Write an enzyme that holds these catalytic residues in place. Structure first.
Site, PDB file in Angstrom:
ATOM      1  N   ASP A   1     -70.533-101.537  73.474  1.00 63.02           N
ATOM      2  CA  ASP A   1     -70.349-101.467  72.037  1.00 63.02           C
ATOM      3  C   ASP A   1     -71.558-101.958  71.249  1.00 63.02           C
ATOM      4  O   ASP A   1     -71.791-103.159  71.171  1.00 63.02           O
ATOM      5  CB  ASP A   1     -69.110-102.311  71.707  1.00 63.02           C
ATOM      6  CG  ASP A   1     -68.661-102.155  70.293  1.00 63.02           C
ATOM      7  OD1 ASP A   1     -69.496-101.761  69.465  1.00 63.02           O
ATOM      8  OD2 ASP A   1     -67.482-102.440  70.016  1.00 63.02           O
ATOM      9  N   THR A   2     -72.318-101.034  70.664  1.00 67.11           N
ATOM     10  CA  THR A   2     -73.494-101.399  69.881  1.00 67.11           C
ATOM     11  C   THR A   2     -73.106-101.991  68.517  1.00 67.11           C
ATOM     12  O   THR A   2     -73.943-102.558  67.800  1.00 67.11           O
ATOM     13  CB  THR A   2     -74.415-100.192  69.653  1.00 67.11           C
ATOM     14  OG1 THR A   2     -73.682 -99.146  69.018  1.00 67.11           O
ATOM     15  CG2 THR A   2     -74.973 -99.696  70.955  1.00 67.11           C
ATOM     16  N   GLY A   3     -71.831-101.861  68.161  1.00 66.49           N
ATOM     17  CA  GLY A   3     -71.376-102.399  66.896  1.00 66.49           C
ATOM     18  C   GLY A   3     -70.893-103.841  67.003  1.00 66.49           C
ATOM     19  O   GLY A   3     -70.554-104.447  65.999  1.00 66.49           O
TER      20      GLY A   3
HETATM   21  C1  LIG Z   1     -66.232-107.591  68.760  1.00 68.08           C
HETATM   22  C2  LIG Z   1     -66.944-108.187  67.540  1.00 68.08           C
HETATM   23  C3  LIG Z   1     -68.079-109.102  67.999  1.00 68.08           C
HETATM   24  C4  LIG Z   1     -65.982-108.936  66.634  1.00 68.08           C
HETATM   25  O1  LIG Z   1     -67.570-107.070  66.738  1.00 68.08           O
HETATM   26  C5  LIG Z   1     -66.867-106.031  66.137  1.00 68.08           C
HETATM   27  O2  LIG Z   1     -65.640-105.909  66.091  1.00 68.08           O
HETATM   28  N1  LIG Z   1     -67.785-105.154  65.574  1.00 68.08           N
HETATM   29  C6  LIG Z   1     -67.164-103.956  64.964  1.00 68.08           C
HETATM   30  C7  LIG Z   1     -67.908-103.567  63.674  1.00 68.08           C
HETATM   31  C8  LIG Z   1     -67.655-104.504  62.530  1.00 68.08           C
HETATM   32  C9  LIG Z   1     -68.570-105.505  62.216  1.00 68.08           C
HETATM   33  C10 LIG Z   1     -68.288-106.437  61.203  1.00 68.08           C
HETATM   34  C11 LIG Z   1     -67.083-106.355  60.498  1.00 68.08           C
HETATM   35  C12 LIG Z   1     -66.175-105.358  60.800  1.00 68.08           C
HETATM   36  C13 LIG Z   1     -66.462-104.441  61.811  1.00 68.08           C
HETATM   37  C14 LIG Z   1     -67.140-102.727  65.941  1.00 68.08           C
HETATM   38  O3  LIG Z   1     -66.490-101.635  65.325  1.00 68.08           O
HETATM   39  C15 LIG Z   1     -66.391-103.059  67.241  1.00 68.08           C
HETATM   40  N2  LIG Z   1     -66.167-101.868  68.006  1.00 68.08           N
HETATM   41  C16 LIG Z   1     -64.807-101.683  68.492  1.00 68.08           C
HETATM   42  C17 LIG Z   1     -64.303-102.938  69.213  1.00 68.08           C
HETATM   43  C18 LIG Z   1     -62.986-102.743  69.909  1.00 68.08           C
HETATM   44  C19 LIG Z   1     -62.824-101.718  70.838  1.00 68.08           C
HETATM   45  C20 LIG Z   1     -61.588-101.506  71.470  1.00 68.08           C
HETATM   46  C21 LIG Z   1     -60.497-102.336  71.169  1.00 68.08           C
HETATM   47  C22 LIG Z   1     -60.647-103.374  70.238  1.00 68.08           C
HETATM   48  C23 LIG Z   1     -61.892-103.569  69.616  1.00 68.08           C
HETATM   49  C24 LIG Z   1     -63.817-101.263  67.405  1.00 68.08           C
HETATM   50  O4  LIG Z   1     -63.448-102.026  66.516  1.00 68.08           O
HETATM   51  N3  LIG Z   1     -63.405-100.012  67.492  1.00 68.08           N
HETATM   52  C25 LIG Z   1     -62.462 -99.444  66.564  1.00 68.08           C
HETATM   53  C26 LIG Z   1     -63.219 -98.933  65.334  1.00 68.08           C
HETATM   54  C27 LIG Z   1     -62.372 -98.150  64.348  1.00 68.08           C
HETATM   55  C28 LIG Z   1     -62.163 -96.691  64.768  1.00 68.08           C
HETATM   56  O5  LIG Z   1     -62.986 -96.178  65.563  1.00 68.08           O
HETATM   57  O6  LIG Z   1     -61.183 -96.055  64.299  1.00 68.08           O
HETATM   58  C29 LIG Z   1     -61.753 -98.313  67.345  1.00 68.08           C
HETATM   59  O7  LIG Z   1     -62.384 -97.615  68.160  1.00 68.08           O
HETATM   60  N4  LIG Z   1     -60.442 -98.155  67.127  1.00 68.08           N
HETATM   61  C30 LIG Z   1     -59.655 -97.131  67.825  1.00 68.08           C
HETATM   62  C31 LIG Z   1     -59.192 -97.681  69.186  1.00 68.08           C
HETATM   63  C32 LIG Z   1     -58.228 -98.831  69.083  1.00 68.08           C
HETATM   64  C33 LIG Z   1     -56.859 -98.603  68.909  1.00 68.08           C
HETATM   65  C34 LIG Z   1     -55.950 -99.667  68.810  1.00 68.08           C
HETATM   66  C35 LIG Z   1     -56.406-100.968  68.881  1.00 68.08           C
HETATM   67  C36 LIG Z   1     -57.779-101.211  69.051  1.00 68.08           C
HETATM   68  C37 LIG Z   1     -58.677-100.143  69.153  1.00 68.08           C
HETATM   69  C38 LIG Z   1     -58.446 -96.637  67.004  1.00 68.08           C
HETATM   70  N5  LIG Z   1     -57.968 -95.432  67.313  1.00 68.08           N
HETATM   71  O8  LIG Z   1     -57.954 -97.335  66.104  1.00 68.08           O
END
Ligand SMILES: CC(C)(C)OC(=O)N[C@@H](Cc1ccccc1)[C@H](O)CN[C@@H](Cc1ccccc1)C(=O)N[C@@H](CCC(=O)O)C(=O)N[C@@H](Cc1ccccc1)C(N)=O
Lengths: 99, 99
Positions: free
Chosen positions: A25-27
């Site tokens: 995860d680059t984010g």
């Molecule tokens: C982990 C730390 C160090 C806290 O960093 C971030 O969360 N950085 C986030 C960016 C950010 C920075 C500052 C403030 C706010 C946001 C990235 O988005 C992190 N990338 C992934 C981390 C992750 C992956 C998997 C599980 C939990 C968490 C993410 O949130 N991904 C979301 C981004 C939103 C999106 O893409 O729609 C995602 O893929 N969500 C999917 C998968 C999912 C489903 C259910 C629960 C968790 C994840 C979804 N369909 O909702």
């Protein structure tokens, strides 16, 4: 390797002697892994993401092998849905985004 | 370009004439943005991150420009602390993770 992004970038990691799967995860500024027992003293902390803040246990100087490549750095452990490898560790394997 | 991860991978994105900055996020399935006051219909949905879930509005066929690359895709608008370019758009620009 060159990893295209049509599907989630999941790779194998070896931490504390066990093989697991983790998302590159680059984010993420940091590395957050699902609950697990790690060696050493930990510090309580809070990191924030898309839906808010979660509490985590911070372990420093932990060795991790990401697709065979060794790295050592801080690992945050807590109620995450999945293992996230963040920039703190990605920079150590020389990971880059290209286009 | 070949971007290293020592600092957050922020880039310029132009959307609806407005210029903004967003994070190249290989850990995000979708692209999530602050209100862009986009014309057209949308579909509500829930997405999650680290920390819980958020409600967003989904807009399809949005013309967006990322680093001089023009793409069209789904943009999810909502209460994200920061703009995120997810894999749905990272693939459109031929972006890969490399190490
Ligand atoms: C982990 C730390 C160090 C806290 O960093 C971030 O969360 N950085 C986030 C960016 C950010 C920075 C500052 C403030 C706010 C946001 C990235 O988005 C992190 N990338 C992934 C981390 C992750 C992956 C998997 C599980 C939990 C968490 C993410 O949130 N991904 C979301 C981004 C939103 C999106 O893409 O729609 C995602 O893929 N969500 C999917 C998968 C999912 C489903 C259910 C629960 C968790 C994840 C979804 N369909 O909702």
């Amino acid at each position: 390797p060159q990893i295209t992004l049509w599907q989630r970038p999941l790779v194998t990691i070896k931490i504390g002697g066990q093989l697991k799967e983790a998302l590159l995860d680059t984010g993420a500024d940091d590395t957050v892994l699902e609950e697990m027992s790690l060696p050493g003293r930990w510090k309580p902390k809070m990191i924030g993401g898309i839906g808010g803040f979660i509490k985590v246990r911070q372990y420093d100087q932990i060795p991790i092998e990401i697709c065979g490549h060794k790295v050592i750095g801080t690992v945050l452990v807590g109620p995450t849905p999945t293992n996230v490898i963040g920039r703190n560790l990605l920079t150590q394997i020389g990971c880059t985004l290209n286009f």
